[PDB]
Design a binder for this molecule. Structure first.
Ligand code: HEM
Ligand code: HEM
Ligand SMILES: Cn1c(=O)c2c(ncn2C)n(C)c1=O
Ligand SMILES: Cn1c(=O)c2c(ncn2C)n(C)c1=O
Ligand SMILES: Cn1c(=O)c2c(ncn2C)n(C)c1=O
Ligand SMILES: Cn1c(=O)c2c(ncn2C)n(C)c1=O
Ligand SMILES: Cn1c(=O)c2c(ncn2C)n(C)c1=O
Ligand SMILES: Cn1c(=O)c2c(ncn2C)n(C)c1=O
Lengths: 467, 467
């Protein structure tokens, strides 16, 4: 009942007093972010709470966050919190643990070098132009535009081609088999009834694993396992058309210290890259277009910067993307306000003392990225969208352990450079062509979901006018 | 269903073909020992089977057993197979794992040195004389004697006094609170319905742990937790009566590298020493008295040896016990025929290759002590009780990885020297006084249980005549 609930009381650590069985989950009625903000204001730099019987220790000091995320990563803080049932997706790099993770991360890093990314840019840019043609169709018809639909389709297009060589105008092929299945790989709402039920009954996870029940929908993982094997074969026959997708890069890796990726592991990476990058990219893109529609001066400045680097609507390149400083500032400032991961977490696998504080074995150590991104101690007027924060002049005062939209240390976002390049390539191609102005039905100011995902209450709709 | 059942088929390893869900447990209808003998005869040096979905790899080569039990103990083969639900007995040294085990084993080894044992001998010998007075009462009344009752009471007497300073003629006080509770700490029958059900439904263990259901009976562990705390206090007051029991030795250890034993850990050791030594000691003692009643020449020789070392029925001492060579040979030969642990087991925690064979992570590696003790390749006429096997002349040919009545390596029986001293002290004091002859109701030859414990089908009853 109150089996594990005496922990933070004994260590002297403050927090919200838990209820038997539930722990503190009734406090999630306003979402993770409002709960972490409120805990921070009340209890200060460190506090504890219980997801059911699972103790979670929140930390906010940048030197102590560096010890967890960086310094003692391989020794103590290696793994994220177990969730399940995951079935074979246990072999996905984001879910693997200890030596399996370290091996998988070693096997996959060459797949995310800037050289392989530079090679993928011509593919991504192709669907930037596809986004423009579809944006135009909805702009020449004066009609408000749902960002997540048009950015969802773009993120989908980039995914299908950069991971499998599958080239699809998903917007206009919404019933292509590959689109209908990929659309289902959406991030998990850990506040929905099923996951809250598992949190309160974690002893039921083994029961679901043995019945082959799985949080990754069976129909979609089956479709991709057999889709991947069909590509694996057919790539061995017509072996002249060189490919630059993730699949091909992972196929070449098993043609080898460590063991090469097994065919099942490879399918698990392919699945988790999609899950990791699909709804995230489109969510961020939508948040950015919101800030630019509500800050027309910022939008004008960015469009001026783009036309200076790429005159006469010249196609963006790898090097010209990295050149655009205000674009980078706009992306970063949006990710400060909306760090869609919300939290970073590591399990404490050993009794440890770091920076002076004792951490018992088994605790989940949580870094509350949303709250730290909005803390007045590091960010003046934290609620205002102000890209000059990230000017090269002010970048000296920004702690890489307070601003963590992609995490930090060995287990950070492995697709970070890819996601940044992919979002900026879309942004340039869109802003070269259009301007984005509010509607009357634009939620101004935008409200966040009370749910377990960082996303707007109402969808973001805006008017799109052709330049 | 047949989730894990393709393992040994793929590795090329032979074994009995498993049924869905059950694995091979229907083959346990003749017990562990007959199953391991039969597997050995059929499949040779190495074979595999499934306890439910749990693969077990049996090994028989002494160089490969040394690698598991000795060479790669700390790195790969550290832990025994999980069973549960165990509740807080998770902190008992025999159940602890990895770094917890290593710490507990380090903290408890000084408690089992020959110096502390020499100091406990006067206590143990006291109950040797108590065994004699009770044996006499049943000998002057010509009436057959149930060994396990008279050796059970002796093992109980030695336990209560050497671990808690509690001095009781348990035979004649069978309703003393301390006796009635200790009598319940009996070894587990892993072939009984409850444990077979858990083997086939291991996913139910977490469900029982959360309801505080536990294989160590709650009533008995509660009685001992509060009995121990009563002694812990009262030992701090009258601190003049020096004590030499395990409790006192563990109390002195928390008056300190490692963390000292917590009060809950200490109670867990106290419990597991009883469980480990109570039914085992009396079982072996009974098997020995059987062999001596069925081999009167061996019995005469041993009694002659005792009267040569201890003339005029002199009290046995530490040094005079270690002097008696034929006594040691009789004990060892009995433990060859009846190695009551039946199997040694280690979990394989890593992908390993030892002595040329691949062992996947998660496999249970089993050393089938009963079968190896009766293998014709190492033991001529293995079924005959022949103590000369262990003469100093022939001790050169006996492989310490074939003969493993107490296991081997860092995780071997930590109470081994104590158990040997305790059984020999009883044997001497009894044989100095009595001779043991069969009954008509003596099961000759004795048959082993078809159950999960190495024990006689029928109880062992014998006539006891005073010398
Ligand atoms: C704007 C889009 C994205 C954001 C905001 C984002 C953010 C994050 C964050 C916060 C983490 C946790 C890191 C930590 O715990 O410290 C993470 C992990 C990860 N991300 Fe991203 N990500 C994005 C896109 C992508 C993409 C496109 C991929 C494609 C490969 C990807 C692959 C991964 C993987 C595999 C992990 C787990 C890495 C590991 O455990 O070793 N993400 N991401
Ligand atoms: C004739 C009586 C006994 C026999 C045949 C016996 C045999 C064994 C065997 C075969 C093991 C397994 C070792 C391995 O896995 O390699 C073991 C472990 C153990 N025994 Fe004994 N034992 C006896 C009496 C005792 C006694 C009196 C104690 C009192 C302390 C004791 C304490 C232990 C402990 C604590 C372990 C687990 C050690 C660890 O995991 O580190 N045993 N015993
Ligand atoms: C609240 N919560 C999480 O936030 C979570 C989780 N697994 C992963 N995360 C992030 N589980 C099981 C959970 O209950
Ligand atoms: C509502 N819901 C889920 O949300 C879910 C699930 N299995 C996995 N997930 C994520 N099941 C069975 C379910 O009923
Ligand atoms: C913890 N975490 C994230 O927070 C995440 C992600 N992909 C995107 N995000 C935001 N992955 C794979 C992940 O493991
Ligand atoms: C057959 N068997 C054992 O023999 C066993 C066990 N746990 C320990 N042992 C020894 N379990 C769960 C088991 O099913
Ligand atoms: C028969 N049986 C057992 O043998 C048992 C048990 N809990 C532990 N054990 C060992 N329960 C609940 C049980 O019904
Ligand atoms: C595996 N095992 C045994 O086989 C054993 C024992 N005590 C006696 N025996 C036989 N203990 C504590 C143990 O863990």
């Amino acid at each position: 009942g109150t089996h594990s609930h005496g922990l933070f009381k004994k260590l002297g650590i403050p927090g919200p007093t838990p209820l038997p069985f539930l722990g503190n989950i009734l406090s999630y009625h306003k979402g993770f972010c409002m709960f972490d903000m409120e805990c921070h204001k009340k209890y200060g730099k460190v506090w504890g709470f219980y997801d059911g019987q699972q103790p979670v220790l929140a930390i906010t000091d940048p030197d102590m966050i560096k010890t967890v995320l960086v310094k003692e990563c391989y020794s103590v803080f290696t793994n994220r919190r177990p969730f399940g049932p995951v079935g074979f997706m246990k072999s996905a790099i984001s879910i693997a643990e200890d030596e399996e993770w370290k091996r998988l991360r070693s096997l996959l890093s060459p797949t995310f070098t800037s050289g392989k990314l530079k090679e993928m840019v011509p593919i991504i840019a192709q669907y930037g132009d596809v986004l423009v043609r579809n944006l135009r169709r909805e702009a020449e018809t004066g009609k408000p535009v749902t960002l997540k639909d048009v950015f969802g389709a773009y993120s989908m297009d980039v995914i299908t081609s950069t991971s499998f060589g599958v080239n699809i105008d998903s917007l206009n092929n919404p019933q292509d088999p590959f689109v209908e299945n990929t659309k289902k790989l959406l991030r998990f709402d850990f506040l929905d009834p099923f996951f809250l039920s598992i949190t309160v009954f974690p002893f039921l996870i083994p029961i679901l694993e043995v019945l082959n029940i799985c949080v990754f929908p069976r129909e979609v993982t089956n479709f991709l396992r057999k889709s991947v094997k069909r590509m694996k074969e057919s790539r061995l026959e017509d072996t002249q058309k060189h490919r630059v997708d993730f699949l091909q890069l992972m196929i070449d890796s098993q043609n080898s210290s460590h063991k090469a990726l097994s065919d099942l592991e490879l399918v698990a990476q392919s699945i988790i890259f999609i899950f990791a990058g699909y709804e995230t990219t489109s969510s961020v893109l939508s948040f950015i277009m919101y800030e630019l529609a509500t800050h027309p001066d910022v939008q004008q400045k960015l469009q001026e910067e783009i036309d200076a680097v790429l005159p006469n609507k010249a196609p963006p390149t790898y090097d010209t993307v990295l050149q655009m400083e205000y674009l980078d500032m706009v992306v970063n400032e949006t990710l400060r306000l909306f760090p869609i991961a919300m939290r970073l977490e590591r399990v404490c696998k050993k009794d440890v003392e770091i920076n002076g504080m004792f951490i018992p074995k088994g605790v989940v150590v949580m870094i509350p990225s949303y709250a730290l991104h909005r803390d007045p101690k590091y960010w003046t007027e934290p609620e205002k969208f102000l890209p000059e924060r990230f000017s090269k002049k002010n970048k000296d005062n920004i702690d890489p352990y307070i601003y963590t939209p992609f995490g930090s240390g060995p287990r950070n976002c492995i697709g970070m450079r890819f996601a940044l390049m992919n979002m900026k390539l879309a942004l340039i191609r869109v802003l070269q062509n259009f301007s984005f102005k509010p509607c009357k039905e634009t939620q101004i100011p935008l409200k966040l979901s009370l749910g377990g995902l960082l996303q707007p209450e109402k969808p973001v709709v805006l008017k799109v006018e052709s330049r």
